[PDB]
Design a protein around this ligand. Structure first.
Ligand SMILES: *[C@@H]1[C@H](O)[C@@H](O)[C@H](O[C@H]2O[C@H](COS(=O)(=O)O)[C@@H](O)[C@H](O)[C@H]2NC(C)=O)[C@@H](C(=O)O)[C@H]1O
Ligand SMILES: *[C@@H]1O[C@H](CO[C@@H]2O[C@@H](C)[C@@H](O)[C@@H](O)[C@@H]2O)[C@@H](O)[C@H](O)[C@H]1NC(C)=O
Ligand code: NAG
Ligand code: NAG
Ligand code: NAG
Ligand code: CL
Lengths: 74, 385
């Protein structure tokens, strides 16, 4: 008949997730795109990012281990 | 085949400004393949970055290395978990001597727990587990190159995540009991996602199931690969337009609270109808302390009708049902909420996410190959304070 009965456990919280439970990445490799400044400066993209606040933003990826900080580079 | 690249103060500022202006907490992965003669981590490059970030007053959290289990494949360098643990202890000492001495440190961002990865994670947590704020590991269901549409809809594929999570907790409970466990990079499919699948409505079965199971099983934070970038598992495409998983993510954020409860379907068949239950997000101005949020996935090829148990059977329920906009069905990149296409109002303005109130005491209709949230109003659940 396609009807299904649900059972609920509501006595106490079984776990507590972070308010930032649903978080996001930006891949380390995006910093090798010549347009990195243009992309992350996009007002449209920032509006969508603000929509998922609060969240962690992990800057990381395979390229994490192939990136070197050069304080002289422009 | 991977080559060193450099990045500038400019690139750091672009990244930081994007996080700060978007209300996100930046975690920056440091290069773990910078090594001394005796294969110790050489922290001198990290020192330069910590000093620059300090000088700009940047509030940043840290990681060191990405999938160190595959360093031999990627760079012909083998770092064992013991040494990596020692490397993290050295980073922790640098952070403690920095302007942000209470900065958080996460790692080691291992892949899913195959035997060799489980061993590296265990030896890493024995050596280094004292200095990390959370244990990070990664998960993908499929290879993007070979994934099929049927795979994206297969409960036997979804169920494999349960065994990965159990294996990670077995390692952590043996070494650092009670340490928080995070998914540090996760998606439907690796290699940038499954073409024509990872960017569609059909991606949402895996994403919502992962969130449900992660919350239910004790994972505290799930980091989606990727917000934006190369690979069709992105939430936002090359035109800065949101894909169905962005809308699903936003709805999840608006409705689902931090306190995790449990739902299950009466009867021996629990594969294709998947149910999750939390307290309602208290920040949602429509709802009140004690309200419940149920979310459900229907992988059956017919509509199912859910009946709520006593004492919730006659409560006002708000439906938030996601279905694809045609003509491409589950392979659509457009989604409707309760029959209204979800689209930006403009570049600065997200749309309202409009509920559909159901008749009190009606069963909850869930169409074939769909997912929905249901808020149970005036549920008055004491556990939800
Ligand atoms: C997690 C890794 O940390 C992550 O970097 C990786 O995604 C990136 O790397 C993928 C492999 O590229 S390559 O063949 O080794 O050159 C690449 O296919 C993705 O496009 C890239 N993603 C981004 C957003 O830049 C993922 C993955 O998808 O494989 C995980 O391995
Ligand atoms: C539809 O799915 C069938 C298997 O699922 C079961 O049968 C259907 C009618 C529903 O009752 C569902 O709840 C059951 O679990 C397949 O055997 C059948 O081939 C499918 N039909 C088509 C044409 O795809
Ligand atoms: C990256 O640079 C470091 C030190 O500057 C070096 O040890 C390493 O061999 C380089 N890796 C590649 C792949 O060129
Ligand atoms: C670490 O790296 C820097 C720059 O590449 C190098 O000059 C320094 O001497 C290294 N330290 C050790 C102990 O190898
Ligand atoms: C791990 O690596 C170091 C060298 O980097 C070595 O001295 C040590 O014995 C190794 N540990 C194990 C358990 O093999
Ligand atoms: Cl190891």
């Amino acid at each position: 008949q396609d009807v299904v009965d649900l059972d609920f456990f509501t006595q106490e919280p079984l776990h507590l997730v972070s308010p930032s439970f649903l978080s996001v990445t930006i891949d380390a490799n995006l910093a090798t795109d010549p347009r990195f400044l243009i992309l992350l400066g996009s007002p449209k993209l920032r509006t969508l990012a603000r929509g998922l606040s609060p969240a962690y933003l992990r800057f990381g990826g395979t390229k994490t281990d192939f990136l070197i900080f050069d304080p002289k580079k422009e | 085949k991977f080559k060193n690249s450099t990045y500038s103060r400019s690139s750091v500022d672009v990244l930081y400004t994007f996080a700060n202006c978007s209300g996100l907490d930046l975690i920056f992965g440091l290069n773990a393949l910078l090594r001394t003669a005796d294969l110790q981590w050489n922290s001198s490059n990290a020192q330069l970055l910590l000093d620059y970030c300090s000088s700009k007053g940047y509030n940043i959290s840290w990681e060191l290395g990405n999938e160190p289990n595959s360093f031999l494949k990627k760079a012909d360098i083998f770092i064992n978990g013991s040494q990596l643990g020692e490397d993290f202890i050295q980073l922790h000492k640098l952070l403690r001597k920095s302007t942000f001495k209470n900065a958080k440190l996460y790692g080691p961002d291992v892949g899913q727990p195959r035997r060799k990865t489980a061993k590296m994670l265990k030896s890493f947590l024995k050596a280094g587990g004292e200095v990390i704020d959370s244990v990070t590991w990664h998960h993908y269901y499929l290879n993007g190159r070979t994934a099929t549409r049927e795979d994206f809809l297969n409960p036997d594929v979804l169920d494999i995540f349960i065994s990965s999570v159990q294996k990670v907790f077995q390692v952590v409970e043996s070494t650092r009991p009670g340490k928080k466990v995070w998914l540090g990079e996760t998606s439907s499919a690796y290699g940038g996602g499954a073409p024509l699948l990872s960017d569609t409505f059909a991606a949402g079965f895996m994403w919502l199931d992962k969130l449900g199971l992660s919350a239910r099983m004790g994972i505290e934070v799930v980091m989606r690969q990727v917000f934006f970038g190369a690979g069709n598992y992105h939430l936002v495409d090359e035109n800065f337009d949101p894909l169905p998983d962005y809308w699903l993510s936003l709805l999840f954020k608006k409705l689902v609270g931090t306190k995790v409860l449990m739902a299950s379907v009466q009867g021996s068949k629990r594969r294709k109808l998947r149910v999750y239950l939390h307290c309602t997000n208290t920040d949602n101005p429509r709802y009140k302390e004690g309200d419940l949020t149920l979310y459900a996935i229907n992988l059956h090829n017919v509509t199912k009708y859910l009946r709520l148990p006593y004492p919730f059977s006659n409560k006002q329920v708000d439906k938030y049902l996601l279905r694809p906009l045609g003509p491409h069905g589950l392979l659509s990149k457009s989604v409707q909420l309760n029959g209204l296409t979800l689209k930006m109002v403009d570049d600065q303005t997200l749309p309202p996410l409009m509920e559909k109130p159901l008749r009190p005491g009606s069963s909850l209709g869930l169409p074939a190959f769909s997912y929905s949230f249901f808020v149970i109003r005036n549920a008055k659940v004491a556990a939800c304070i």
